[PDB]
């Protein structure tokens, strides 16, 4: 059977609303006046009335901007009923596919991460790992893809940047010699996550690294 294709709708639309998506039509409007309706979540169940159909034209309508992070897919049914009150078609499925916009900054799992490392480990040594997530799509886009960076380190002793961070994994490492617990026993690193694998929104957190004895 010939059916309506999934309808792709990007989130956060300007409208104007209501917005025509597609026009349902039964063949039998030849012999009969037809009344179209729609059921399902987003229509007649929660959230009600996000989608509506014009009773006589069969225009399916979107009534407000969508949010993919709330609902990414609606599955509705279209109905066709004659003036005399008889269902004249089996209900048809209709799918609405909400597509992504980069509308989330990344978020660090904690605001402050704590880890530690021994003085005198070789440069190259893994210290700890940080994590930030991103609500947006990261399959088809870089909207959800986070890149990690270190913005600054305190104090600047012995040298000004002793650590680096692995840009996709969040793993912090020692890249320098001179960690000495007795002179600088702890460090605070401002760390950053930027979605669009680097090119996007930036979020900030702290990593506090203890120098073990």
Residue 145, both tokens: 């893809």
Beta strands 107-108 and 34-39 are unpaired
Which of 27, 152, 177, 204: binder of a second copy (CB under 8 A)? Answer: 27
* CB of residue 30 to a second copy, shortest distance in Å: 11
Which of 11, 26, 43, 127: binder of a second copy (CB under 8 A)? Answer: 26
Q: Which is nearer to Ca ion, 134 or 192 (CB)?
A: 134
Q: Which is nearer to Ca ion, 82 or 102 (CB)?
A: 102
Examine residue 140 and tell whether it contacts a second copy (CB under 8 A): no
With beta carbons less than 8 A apart as the criterion, state whether 179 and 106 touch: no
Identify residues 30-89 at the interface with a second copy (CB under 8 A). 58, 78, 80, 89
- Left if phi > 0, otherwise alpha if psi is -120 to 50, otherwise beta: which for 78? beta
Q: Which is nearer to Ca ion, 68 or 79 (CB)?
A: 68
Beta strands 59-62 and 19-23 are antiparallel
Report the 10 Å Cβ neighbour count for 116. 12
**Nearest one of 135, 152, 153 to 144, comparing CA atoms:** 135
Q: Which is nearer to a second copy, 14 or 30 (CB)?
A: 30
- Left if phi > 0, otherwise alpha if psi is -120 to 50, otherwise beta: which for 209? beta
Which of 12, 17, 28, 49: binder of a second copy (CB under 8 A)? Answer: 28
| 86 contact choice in Ca ion, a second copy, none (CB below 5 to 8 Å, kind-dependent) | none
**Nearest one of 54, 72, 52, 79 to 64, comparing CA atoms:** 52
* CB of residue 40 to a second copy, shortest distance in Å: 16
| 67 contact choice in a second copy, Ca ion, none (CB below 5 to 8 Å, kind-dependent) | Ca ion
In the complex, the residues that contact a second copy under the rule CB under 8 A are: 1-5, 23-28, 58, 78, 80, 89, 92
């Amino acid at each position: 059977d010939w059916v309506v294709a999934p309808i792709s709708v990007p989130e956060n639309g300007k409208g104007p609303f209501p917005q025509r998506l597609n026009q349902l039509k039964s063949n039998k409007d030849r012999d009969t006046k037809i009344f179209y309706s729609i059921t399902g979540p987003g229509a007649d169940s929660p959230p009600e009335g996000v989608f509506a159909v014009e009773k006589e034209t069969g225009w399916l309508l979107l009534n407000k901007p969508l949010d993919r992070e709330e609902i990414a897919k609606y599955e509705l049914f279209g109905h066709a009923v004659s003036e005399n009150g008889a269902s004249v078609e089996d209900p048809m499925n209709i799918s609405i596919i909400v597509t992504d916009l980069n509308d989330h900054k990344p978020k660090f799992t904690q605001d402050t991460f704590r880890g530690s490392v021994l003085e005198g480990v070789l440069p190259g040594t893994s210290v700890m790992q940080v994590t930030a997530t991103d609500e947006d799509d990261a399959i088809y886009t870089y909207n959800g893809v986070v890149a990690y960076s270190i913005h600054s380190q305190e104090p600047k002793d012995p040298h000004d940047l002793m650590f680096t961070i692995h840009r996709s994994t969040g793993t912090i490492s020692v890249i320098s010699s001179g960690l000495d617990r007795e002179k600088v026993p702890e460090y605070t690193l401002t760390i950053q996550a930027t979605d669009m694998d680097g090119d996007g929104s930036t979020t900030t957190a702290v990593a506090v690294v203890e120098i073990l004895d």
